[PDB]
Amino acid sequence: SLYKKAGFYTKLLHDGIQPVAAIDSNFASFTYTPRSLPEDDTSMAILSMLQDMNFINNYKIDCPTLARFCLMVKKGYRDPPYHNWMHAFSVSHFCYLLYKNLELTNYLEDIEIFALFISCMCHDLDHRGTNNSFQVASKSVLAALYSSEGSVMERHHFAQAIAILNTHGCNIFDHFSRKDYQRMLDLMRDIILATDLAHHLRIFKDLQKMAEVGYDRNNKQHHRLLLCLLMTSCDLSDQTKGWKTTRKIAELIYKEFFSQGDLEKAMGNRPMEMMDREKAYIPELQISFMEHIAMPIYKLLQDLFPKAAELYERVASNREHWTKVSHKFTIRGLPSNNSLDFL
Amino acid sequence: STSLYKKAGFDEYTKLLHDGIQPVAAIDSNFASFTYTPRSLPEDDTSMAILSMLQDMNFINNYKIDCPTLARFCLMVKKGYRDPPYHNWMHAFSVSHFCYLLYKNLELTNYLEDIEIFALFISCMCHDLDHRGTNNSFQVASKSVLAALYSSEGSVMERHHFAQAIAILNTHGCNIFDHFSRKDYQRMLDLMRDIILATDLAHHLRIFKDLQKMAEVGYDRNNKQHHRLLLCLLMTSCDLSDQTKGWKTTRKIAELIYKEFFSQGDLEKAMGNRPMEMMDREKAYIPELQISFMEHIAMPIYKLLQDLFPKAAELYERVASNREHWTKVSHKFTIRGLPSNNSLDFL
Ligand SMILES: C[C@@H](c1ccc(C(F)(F)F)cc1)n1nc(CC(F)(F)F)c2c(=O)[nH]c(=O)[nH]c21
Ligand SMILES: C[C@@H](c1ccc(C(F)(F)F)cc1)n1nc(CC(F)(F)F)c2c(=O)[nH]c(=O)[nH]c21
Ligand SMILES: [Mg+2]
Ligand SMILES: [Mg+2]
Ligand SMILES: [Zn+2]
Numbered sequence: 001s002l003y004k005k006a007g008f009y010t011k012l013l014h015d016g017i018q019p020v021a022a023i024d025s026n027f028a029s030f031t032y033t034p035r036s037l038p039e040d041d042t043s044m045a046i047l048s049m050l051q052d053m054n055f056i057n058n059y060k061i062d063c064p065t066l067a068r069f070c071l072m073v074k075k076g077y078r079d080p081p082y083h084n085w086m087h088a089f090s091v092s093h094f095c096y097l098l099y100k101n102l103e104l105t106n107y108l109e110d111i112e113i114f115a116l117f118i119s120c121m122c123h124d125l126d127h128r129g130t131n132n133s134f135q136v137a138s139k140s141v142l143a144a145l146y147s148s149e150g151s152v153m154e155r156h157h158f159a160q161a162i163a164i165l166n167t168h169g170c171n172i173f174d175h176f177s178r179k180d181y182q183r184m185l186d187l188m189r190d191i192i193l194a195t196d197l198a199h200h201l202r203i204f205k206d207l208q209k210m211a212e213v214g215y216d217r218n219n220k221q222h223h224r225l226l227l228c229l230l231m232t233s234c235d236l237s238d239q240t241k242g243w244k245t246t247r248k249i250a251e252l253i254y255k256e257f258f259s260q261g262d263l264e265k266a267m268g269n270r271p272m273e274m275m276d277r278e279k280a281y282i283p284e285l286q287i288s289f290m291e292h293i294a295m296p297i298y299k300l301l302q303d304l305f306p307k308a309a310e311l312y313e314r315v316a317s318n319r320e321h322w323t324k325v326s327h328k329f330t331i332r333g334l335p336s337n338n339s340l341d342f343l
Numbered sequence: 344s345t346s347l348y349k350k351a352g353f354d355e356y357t358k359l360l361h362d363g364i365q366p367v368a369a370i371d372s373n374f375a376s377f378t379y380t381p382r383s384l385p386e387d388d389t390s391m392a393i394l395s396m397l398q399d400m401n402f403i404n405n406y407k408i409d410c411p412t413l414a415r416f417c418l419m420v421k422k423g424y425r426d427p428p429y430h431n432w433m434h435a436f437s438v439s440h441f442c443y444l445l446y447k448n449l450e451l452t453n454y455l456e457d458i459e460i461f462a463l464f465i466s467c468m469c470h471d472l473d474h475r476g477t478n479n480s481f482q483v484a485s486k487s488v489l490a491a492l493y494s495s496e497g498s499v500m501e502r503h504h505f506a507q508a509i510a511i512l513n514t515h516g517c518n519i520f521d522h523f524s525r526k527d528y529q530r531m532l533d534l535m536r537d538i539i540l541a542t543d544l545a546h547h548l549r550i551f552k553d554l555q556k557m558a559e560v561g562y563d564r565n566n567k568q569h570h571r572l573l574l575c576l577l578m579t580s581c582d583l584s585d586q587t588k589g590w591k592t593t594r595k596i597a598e599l600i601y602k603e604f605f606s607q608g609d610l611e612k613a614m615g616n617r618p619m620e621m622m623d624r625e626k627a628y629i630p631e632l633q634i635s636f637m638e639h640i641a642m643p644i645y646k647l648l649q650d651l652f653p654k655a656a657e658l659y660e661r662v663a664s665n666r667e668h669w670t671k672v673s674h675k676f677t678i679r680g681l682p683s684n685n686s687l688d689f690l
């Protein structure tokens with residue numbers, strides 16, 4: 001359960017901004033797997049995506065400040081199996097896919113799309129590989145600061161994002177008007193807080209009604225709800241990839257969750273069944289997660305954007321794959337080597 | 344028709360700064376005492392009294408606040424309250440005055456940061472902005488625009504009060520803190536959000552055990568959570584401070600509270616719903632409701648305050664004394680709801 005922080009540029013300045021097709025001919029496709037990109041190329045890909053969406057030119061972002069900000073955000077992640085920089089990078093890449101494939105500019109303002117992308121980059125900053133309930137249980141300084149207001153980790157992720165903006169030479173919004181600077185902070189706060197599953201559960205009925213009635217671009221609340229839905233669709237986007245990606249991400253998720261369970265046991269507390277390597281049956285847990293959490297989010301996305309149909313179909317297909325592979329997975333927890341390759 | 348409460352305008356200035364800011368002793372020699380009843384000050388003098396309190400606490404000088412901006416901000420906040428019997432500007436003014444009394448009598452500068460005390464006072468002025476004379480449950484039942492915006496997160500009215508405070512700061516010529524650094528401006532917004540949200544009784548009940556733990560172990564001025572808990576406790580003590588005044592005040596405030604609550608109950612009945620017993624003029628027995636409110640909500644707040652600040656003992660004693668007064672009333676009060684003339688002057 002020990003996950004380290006790497007700390008407390010010239011390559012990016014020389015050729016950090018590349019045409020996205022040079023990264024991969026399939027880079028702007030829903031079939032691209034951003035985890036296939038070497039970690040050392042991810043900062044360049046972030047700048048390339050911001051350039052391709054034209055935010056660097058439109059918002060007059062200083063490229064050296066943007067390169068420093070990207071490197072700070074990357075260094076802001078610890079190394080647990082799942083909640084690491086490669087996860088934030090892949091969530092950011094999905095936001096870019098939504099911009100490139102769906103007609104986002106016809107639903108949201110440019111500033112809202114920009115905040116969604118930056119929020120994707122920052123949304124799990126300084127994650128400890130433990131959930132909100134663990135923060136409360138371990139009586140952590142994060143729980144001491146935020147538990148009374150809800151969403152302990154998410155309030156921390158936003159605080160970490162603000163701390164990077166306040167670091168000398170990293171403020172990518174430095175030249176914005178006081179009104180636009182504040183608008184960015186408010187959007188980042190709302191979007192990052194939307195990543196707490198408890199928040200999604202509380203607003204589900206309202207997202208359901210928005211898709212039922214129809215998206216109204218003149219309704220400010222519809223913009224807020226859509227941003228919440230888009231953010232959760234980016235956070236769960238590993239489930240929209242191929243079966244091999246889904247299988248590997250289950251391995252990473254459960255290695256992280258089971259380490260939390262082991263730590264709770266060492267503290268003399270009984271963990272939730274899903275975090276207990278002695279009780280959890282991964283295929284059943286993943287089928288339930290896909291049915292209750294991921295599939296409804298992508299079905300809502302399909303209802304608002306017809307071009308998103310393939311995402312829901314992929315999630316449903318990955319759910320069916322777990323049922324078919326469960327006959328070969330006869331154990332609780334993970335195998336001795338923590339790998340699901342045998343499936 | 345008694346549920347219709349108007350806004351004076353939409354979401355007296357030159358006159359407010361003509362003779363300069365008044366020293367508090369010129370307003371009243373008893374202005375900084377726990378025996379002062381701020382509801383006695385004429386409503387037209389309240390904006391000047393707010394500036395006078397900010398000047399006496401040295402916030403205008405220490406933060407170099409622009410006096411015309413502060414005068415406009417004060418007038419916008421005052422105009423931001425509707426006219427229900429209890430949740431009107433005189434309540435926000437009285438709550439702000441109590442904050443000032445805590446500053447003067449409990450020497451808060453030895454427990455909290457200057458910016459925290461400043462945010463507490465501003466939050467007191469703004470904490471019930473645009474109140475409709477209804478509770479949070481009513482917003483959900485009436486399917487209001489406020490419930491549509493905030494019901495999932497709880498504290499519907501309190502999130503609205505904070506939003507209204509922010510809208511005033513965003514009005515041209517009303518941003519009293521726009522010269523603050525980005526870090527300090529954010530600190531002020533976070534403090535105002537937390538302090539206003541602490542006025543939801545459900546929030547107070549959730550943090551109650553932690554407030555008791557803090558009072559038991561002892562306040563630590565180096566502990567950030569202790570500062571946050573203390574701000575919540577002080578805000579709740581300001582919000583219920585009418586109970587620390589004389590019996591005449593407690594009796595009048597019961598009249599105002601129940602006129603407001605019963606109008607909500609009548610409105611719920613007109614909507615085909617059965618309201619809470621405390622809001623139903625046909626079921627409510629005011630002396631017992633007030634004894635319960637005092638014993639289970641108000642007295643524990645002033646007891647925690649006394650535990651943390653010995654000089655606050657007189658506040659707890661006064662609240663306990665007003666509770667004993669309701670026990671005396673319960674043996675000479677034979678009606679449900681309020682009398683037909685809506686007056687408790689028969690007491
Ligand atoms: C951290 C958590 C989680 C984060 C965020 C949201 C929200 F944004 F929707 F609220 C929900 C859930 N999470 N993430 C995955 C991986 C992913 F599916 F994303 F590929 C999984 C998973 O496979 N099984 C789980 O029981 N929880 C999982
Ligand atoms: C609006 C409510 C109320 C506000 C705020 C808080 C918290 F901040 F503590 F949470 C609790 C309770 N409230 N206010 C009073 C008047 C006062 F006592 F303040 F003089 C009363 C009352 O006499 N009886 C009640 O049943 N509820 C009352
Ligand atoms: Mg998260
Ligand atoms: Mg209130
Ligand atoms: Zn995430």
Ligand SMILES: [Zn+2]
Nearest residue numbers: 434470471582
């Ligand atoms: Zn109040």
